[PDB]
Chain A
Amino acid sequence: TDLFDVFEETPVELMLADSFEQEASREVDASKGLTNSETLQVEQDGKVRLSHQVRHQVALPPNYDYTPIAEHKRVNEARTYPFTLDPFQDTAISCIDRGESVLVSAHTSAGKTVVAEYAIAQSLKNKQRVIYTSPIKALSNQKYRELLAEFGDVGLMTGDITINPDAGCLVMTTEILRSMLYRGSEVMREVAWVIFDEVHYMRDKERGVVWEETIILLPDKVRYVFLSATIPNAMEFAEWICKIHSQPCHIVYTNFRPTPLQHYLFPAHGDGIYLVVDEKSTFREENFQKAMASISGDIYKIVKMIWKKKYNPVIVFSFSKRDCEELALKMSKLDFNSDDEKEALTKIFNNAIALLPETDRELPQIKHILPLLRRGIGIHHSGLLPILKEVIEILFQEGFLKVLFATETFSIGLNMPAKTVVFTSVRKWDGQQFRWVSGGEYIQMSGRAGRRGLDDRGIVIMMIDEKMEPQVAKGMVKGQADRLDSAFHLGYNMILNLMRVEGISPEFMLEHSFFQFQNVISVPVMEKKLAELKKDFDGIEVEDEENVKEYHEIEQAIKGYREDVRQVVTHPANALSFLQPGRLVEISVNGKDNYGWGAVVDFAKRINKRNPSAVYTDHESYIVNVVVNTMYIDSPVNLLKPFNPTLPEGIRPAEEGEKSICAVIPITLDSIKSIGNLRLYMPKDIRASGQKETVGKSLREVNRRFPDGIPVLDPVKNMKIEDEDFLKLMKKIDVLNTKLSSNPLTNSMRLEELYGKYSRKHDLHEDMKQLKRKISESQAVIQLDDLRRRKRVLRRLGFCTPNDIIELKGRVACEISSGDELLLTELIFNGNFNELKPEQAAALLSCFAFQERCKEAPRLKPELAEPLKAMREIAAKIAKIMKDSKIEVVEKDYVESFRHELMEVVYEWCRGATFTQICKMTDVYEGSLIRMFKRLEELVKELVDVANTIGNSSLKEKMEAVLKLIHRDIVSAGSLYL
């Protein structure tokens, strides 16, 4: 008698303005490229005219006082400029000068730089501070030393290096703003202008959360700049921003081409070299189809030809780092520097090696690459050292290295222009698939060739190894600007500090998150449709009588009571021992296609021999065949299969005026609408072209015999079905037999028509709110269900009260962002480092600071592994309750989120090991080691914070003891631009 069994028993049962596109067109010096014909139609000067677009519009607050920015006579060049600026740049600087924020979205070679140059001085002449943003240190390192040469009084802020903290102008990466927006730097309090570059990284599924949220955390007084690659859907951003910080924002689109591009196709081992996209951006079908014709290592022909073409510099693009090193070796019999230049190479090169220790001046990987680097040849990828990464690009920017073997950083790594771009792998792996690269990928991966004042053109050469579909090479090369949408997700350190800072809420973040702008846009259209539907409803809304609703309420009771009986009329262990041939039966298959009255051909059962375990209904395993004369003349009589009720389409009754014929259909007990009590001549002659048609004329003679109605087999009088279940069931209709006829104006006063008068009101009664449920369903923050689960988590972790008041537990990771904050609190709260040594626990910190999988390390010395076994025990119970949290995380896969393999190398660098020696213990490249090494310092320094907040004095003794033992010789790397 367990107390849930009572659930189990069966009971006792009886805005848009200033919207204009402008045109700009100039002439370009002629060039043939490597096609011997000219690339375009020549003009009379020997010039070639191009043209391009200048769109402008501005997003509007309600009721705002607007005057056109095209009229804005700029009273002063707050920065003057030597040459003729461009019309959109002219359009740009007025928006700064008149004092409203603006997105301009162009390509990097266009001169978006120049607009950023202007607002500095207008901030500086008004003594204001200004933020210049970047996602990359080396993006800033470009812009810093540039602006440091330009205006000098510029602060740089980096996780690596701050310079001049109280300068007037500030250049810093994205998260630092976010970090100094959480704790409220007063640095912010003299800033009125922000230069957001690289705005499109909001669609980063990795990091784009930071760009989005940090803009939401802006005070609304501030003016802003926005620079990014061309997207088609730029206005959506302005349409998002202009509300949520409540000031106007202009847009400027262009598609401008600075130096003119020429797309070529090299079939690998094919010999056609085909301009298929001109500078006027036209798909050549025929050259492509010649390139389809010319599709029947290879680079080594191409390069010396390009060197004969003198199209230096030239950049090679792989889709993986190791491929370049191979492609480095496939080319290296050449040389492209003079020994004067190679002295100019080597001497300056040693000054790059001068900032290392002499023990470090002999490190192996750099010994290997340097003769390739001597040969006028460079390689680009991350895996090098950062000191290697900078020296190459210099010598690339100073042109000693004609060749670059590159990946996707240098695609983003600008201020290092090219002349020639090589596409070695057409496709590329996207985390899920070695896929045909999409459009704006390739468009971003286009423009890097062609120096502005120097290069005549842009040389685009793609090696292909498949006869690609025509629209794909279009969709790759004649490309599309890719859509920019929010990749907003959640993260717990964000969830911390919004409770920690009092003034706002995490919910408030979601109210202004762009991730629901999907849920924003189409709804007022549907409101407009609802504002339509709320009107059309009101027309039919009142009929002449209320009782027609009650009649429909009678008809609602009518329609269901016939419904329940027919499924009891179609009884599975009935309509049996009466299915004999000639028994006149009413045919209505499944309640979908009523076929009049017919005569039984036979009855049978469908035998499933191909699938033994499947299920037919006890209705549907039984196969009846019945001749009806209610078959349409043009039904596929030849296509329905005998003894199979799988009827194809076109098979139907003869509709209004359509010719009725006779045919035989395989039917079941579900098809039986009713069965009469007469048997005519059913032919034992099965199919002889005119025995089923004698049935239907005899059916018509039976439709002469009872034109009014066949006496159906009564379950009372004919099938003799006598169940108190069955007989009392009909009583629901035996009110409708009475009460429908009883009701005043059952059909008087055109009540049948007045029903449809009510019904056309009643449908409008249904479908608005049906739509309005959808719109009300289209309201809310859909992310709350994630968030409401995460509200569980910290309470389960005790990081806050159920009143959400943050505990000291949750207070810990407030200075932790650099790792799993969810774990790192518990490890220290499990205190397992009390008997870890600085060499020992550091290997446990290698279990955090690195993500990418590689070869198996051995099972190491167990005094590492048992703490590694110990921390593994902790996070499972954590992820257990995460599984309990309805948070869809595979606990197993949550564990292998932790990577435990470099621990040995970490254990030995703690013991003073040589950089040379530890290089042997992995394949993982040396900068990537440092990329977790200098990550690891950021960890340990944020670990020093914790014992200050707790008082674990042993820990603080142990913490900087670690920090002594990592921060040393090669970890002391600095850069050259700075």
Chain B
Amino acid sequence: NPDVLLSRVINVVRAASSLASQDVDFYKNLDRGFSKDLKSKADKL
């Protein structure tokens, strides 16, 4: 069904738009494990 699952895509589209909006490199400095979790969340991707 289009209107359901794409609304869930739009939900994650905005969340994807919500992702690299913050400065992300600063805790990649403060640990690898931030970056590695960001790597692990990219492993979902």
A residues adjacent to B (C-beta < 8 A):
3, 6-7, 9, 11-14, 553-554, 557, 560-561, 731-732, 735-736, 739
Contact = CB atoms under 8 A, between A and B. Distances in A.
Nearest to B10: A6
Given A6-B10, A6-B13, A736-B29, 13 more contacts: A3-B6, A3-B10, A6-B14, A6-B17, A7-B13, A11-B17, A11-B18, A11-B21, A13-B21, A14-B22, A554-B29, A557-B25, A735-B26
Interface in B1-43: 6, 10, 13-14, 17-18, 21-23, 25-26, 28-30, 32
A12 B18 contact: yes
Contacts of A560: 25
Contacts of B30: 735
Contacts of B13: 6-7
A38 B26 CA distance: 88
A732 B26 contact: yes
A557 B14 CA distance: 29
Contacts of B18: 11-12
A554 B23 CA distance: 17
A588 B17 CA distance: 38
A703 B32 CA distance: 43
Contacts of B22: 13-14
A527 to B, nearest CB: 32
14 contacts: A3-B6, A3-B10, A6-B10, A6-B13, A6-B17, A9-B17, A11-B14, A11-B17, A12-B18, A12-B21, A14-B21, A553-B32, A557-B28, A735-B29
Interface residues of B, number: 15
Contacts of B26: 731-732, 735
Interface of B: 6, 10, 13-14, 17-18, 21-23, 25-26, 28-30, 32
A736 B21 CA distance: 23
B31 to A, nearest CB: 11
Nearest to B15: A11
Contacts of B14: 6, 11
Nearest to B17: A11
A561 B6 CA distance: 39
A13 B13 CA distance: 16
A9 B14 CA distance: 9
Given A3-B10, A6-B10, A6-B14, A557 B21 contact: no
Interface of B is mostly: helix
A554 B29 CA distance: 7
A113 to B, nearest CB: 69
A952 B18 CA distance: 64
Contacts of A554: 29
Contacts of A739: 29
B8 to A, nearest CB: 13
Contacts of A561: 29
A13 B23 CA distance: 9
Nearest to B20: A11
A289 B33 CA distance: 80
Ranked 9 nearest A-B pairs via Cβ = A11-B21, A557-B29, A13-B21, A11-B17, A6-B13, A14-B22, A735-B29, A732-B26, A11-B18
Nearest to B22: A14
A423 B29 CA distance: 76
A639 to B, nearest CB: 43
A357 B21 CA distance: 89
A7 B28 CA distance: 26
Contacts of A11: 14, 17-18, 21
Contacts of A732: 23, 25-26, 29
A274 B18 CA distance: 83
B5 to A, nearest CB: 13
Contacts of A7: 13
A574 B12 CA distance: 40
Contacts of B32: 553
A11 to B, nearest CB: 4
User: A11, A554, A735, A736 — which one has the most chain B CB atoms within 10 A of its CB?
Assistant: A11
A188 B6 CA distance: 61
Nearest to A14: B22
Contacts of A13: 21-22
Nearest to A553: B32
A553 B22 CA distance: 21
B13 to A, nearest CB: 5
A819 B8 CA distance: 54
A561 B29 CA distance: 10
A397 to B, nearest CB: 78
Nearest to B6: A3
Contacts of A14: 21-23
A559 to B, nearest CB: 12
Contacts of B17: 6, 9, 11
B41 to A, nearest CB: 17
A663 B13 CA distance: 57
A638 B13 CA distance: 60
Contacts of A6: 10, 13-14, 17
B33 to A, nearest CB: 13
A11 B25 CA distance: 18
A13 B24 CA distance: 12
A736 B23 CA distance: 16
Contacts of B29: 554, 557, 561, 732, 735-736, 739
A109 B28 CA distance: 76
A14 B17 CA distance: 13
A209 B17 CA distance: 51
Contacts of B25: 557, 560, 732
A477 to B, nearest CB: 67
Nearest to A729: B23
A565 to B, nearest CB: 13
A738 to B, nearest CB: 10
Contacts of A9: 17
B34 to A, nearest CB: 12
A702 B17 CA distance: 52
Nearest to A8: B17
A732 B21 CA distance: 16
A4 to B, nearest CB: 10
A864 to B, nearest CB: 53
Nearest to B14: A6
Nearest to B35: A553
A731 B32 CA distance: 18
Contacts of A736: 29
A11 B23 CA distance: 13
Contacts of B21: 11-14
Nearest to B27: A735
User: B13, B23, B28, B32 — which one has the most chain A CB atoms within 10 A of its CB?
Assistant: B23
Nearest to A554: B29
Contacts of A557: 25, 28-29
A739 B21 CA distance: 25
Nearest to B26: A732
A554 B25 CA distance: 12
A189 to B, nearest CB: 58
A63 B42 CA distance: 50
B23 to A, nearest CB: 8
A549 to B, nearest CB: 11
A98 B13 CA distance: 72
A29 B22 CA distance: 92
A311 B22 CA distance: 90
